[PDB]
Structure formats: structure tokens, C-alpha cells
Amino acid sequence: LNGGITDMLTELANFEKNVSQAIHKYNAYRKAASVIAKYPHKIKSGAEAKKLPGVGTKIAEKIDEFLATGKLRKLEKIRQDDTSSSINFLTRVSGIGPSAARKFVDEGIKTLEDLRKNEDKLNHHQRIGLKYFGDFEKRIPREEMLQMQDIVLNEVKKVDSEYIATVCGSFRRGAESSGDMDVLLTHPSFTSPKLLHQVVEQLQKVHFITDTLSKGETKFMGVCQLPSEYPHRRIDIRLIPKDQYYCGVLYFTGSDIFNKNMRAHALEKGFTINEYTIRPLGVTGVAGEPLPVDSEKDIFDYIQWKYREPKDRSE
DNA sequence: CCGACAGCGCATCAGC
DNA sequence: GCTGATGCGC
DNA sequence: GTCGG
Length: 315
Ligand SMILES: [Cl-]
Ligand code: NA
Ligand code: NA
What we know:
lyase activity; class I DNA-(apurinic or apyrimidinic site) endonuclease activity; DNA polymerase, domain 1; cytoplasm; DNA repair; 13% strand; binds chloride ion; alpha+beta; 4 domains; binds sodium ion; DNA-binding
């Protein structure tokens, strides 16, 4: 319907983030791309799209040019620009953001081949991102996510049977494919020691986790792989306090639109919900002490809301 | 006219 | 060495 | 870039 428009907006978003380093213009184009993607009609004019929330004057003007010419003069020029397209491309490497990409291009490093010739100028993360460049851009079929889940849950239980692990993200919402695996971890002995390390070690022991990007006491980011050769996959593991676990599960399950709506409804009932806690609000608007949470449904019960299955949390 | 737009965990950089 | 800023991913 | 105080 409007693929030509949403592609254009997506491309504009990328160049704003990676070349212009204007993160809010990036999110503005993405927000516009998303709302247009769910618009059940073929857009005939910028004025029509202007009615949608997130689409303003400038984008409406760009849609008019696109619908009349089939292209964008601004986009065409940016594409033909060697510097801008090189900067934009290098950010596809995990660990290379707008700043690093600009740094590399400024000194003649513009291609993936150039990066491989200059390993001494890359940090650990960037080297790993370079090593699995192709694999990291591949989607993860749900069936593979299921196998990965079985391994995570099994090994976690072997370290300590009192651990609780939950694979969130779009996967928990029942998506047919995922971009990565986000695991939320907790334990009754950890509330608001060295628990994350023991779990990472075990997954390394059975050779599920193959590489480490970042690792601390509460968050692990690394690379994993199913036993055969399957592509290497990005995996994150977060260690969350027990009294904050299910608020975390709710938060990282999403979606973003769903969370925004649930937070809105919560406020109308006299509660405030963030990533960590759900708090009651006083008459003056003062937030009280964290309320006890033992399940996802408890959060729904506090705000007098019908429990939404993760499969129906797209909005 | 003009500020909000999410912000935390970790690695790395800038400066003392 | 330290503390705080910046970069990055999600 | 868009929205809203
Ligand atoms: Cl911006
Ligand atoms: Na609009
Ligand atoms: Na990147």
C-alpha cells in the first residue's frame, strides 16, 4: 500500500541518526513510518497523511514529492554521497555507532574490508560485531528461538533450581521471528550477589554462549549459537531483583505502544507504573512506596484491568 | 516560541 | 589512580 | 520532525 513511503521515511530516519546524529529526527521519521504502515489505505497525498498523528508539514511535503516523482531529491543526493552512505553503512556493525562511523570514514575507513584491515583500531565489541556482521542481520525463526529457550531454561535450572528465567521481547508476544533473545533472570536471594556470572559460565560451559560483548553484575550482552551450523545470535541476560522481576517482565515484553497505554490507564486509576515498580499516588500526586508484586496479573489487578495475554499486547 | 521525545548498564574516553 | 562524560545497544 | 504547553 504505502511501502514506497515507509521505505523512504525509514531511509531518512537512518541518515538522521547515523550521519546527522539527530536522534529525535530519527525517532520522528520512524514514528511516522510506523503509523503509515498501519494505515489501511493507499495514501494519495501528503494532506491525507497529515491527518495521522506523527506526520507533520515536512513529511507531508516529502510524500507529495514522492507521489509525484517517485523519488526524493534529498534522498537521491544523500545516496550518491560517498561519505554519508559510508557512515550510514558502517553503523550496521554492532558496536559502531554514529560517532565511530564518522571517525572511521574521516580516516579513509569506509568499507567492511577496510575494517578488517584495521583491527587494531576497533574495540572488542566492534571486532565481534564485525566477525558476525552477516549473522547479526539475520532474523531468528521462532522454532530456533524455542530451541534456544529450552537450552537457557535447562542450564539456568542446573546452576540453581530456584532461579527464574523468562524470555521476553516479541518472542513472548508470539512473534514468528525475533532479532535477538532477551532473557530476564532472578533469584530469591537477590532483592533491592554474584548470580549472573554463574549463569553465564554454565551457558559457556555447554558452549551455547560463544562470545561476550559486555558483562557486569546485572546485565550480560553476548553471542550464542545452537548446536549443529546455525548462525550466531545476539543474546542479552538481565539479572533483576525478585521484588522487581514481574514489573521487568511486563516492561520488556512490551510492546512499546502497549506499555504507553498501560501506563496511561494506570494513572487514571491512581497508580504509576515504570520498569521496576508500581506505586500508588496520593491526593497531591506524591508516589508512595512500591506495591508487592508476585505475578504479572497482580499489576493488572492493581489498576483494575483485565489481564492481557502477551500474544495480544501489540497495542 | 520552545522543550520533550526513555534512560539504564556497561565499555570506553576525557580530564584531573 | 580516580571521577564524570560520552558512546552504544536495547 | 512532531506535538503540545
Ligand atoms: Cl534530533
Ligand atoms: Na499529523
Ligand atoms: Na552499530
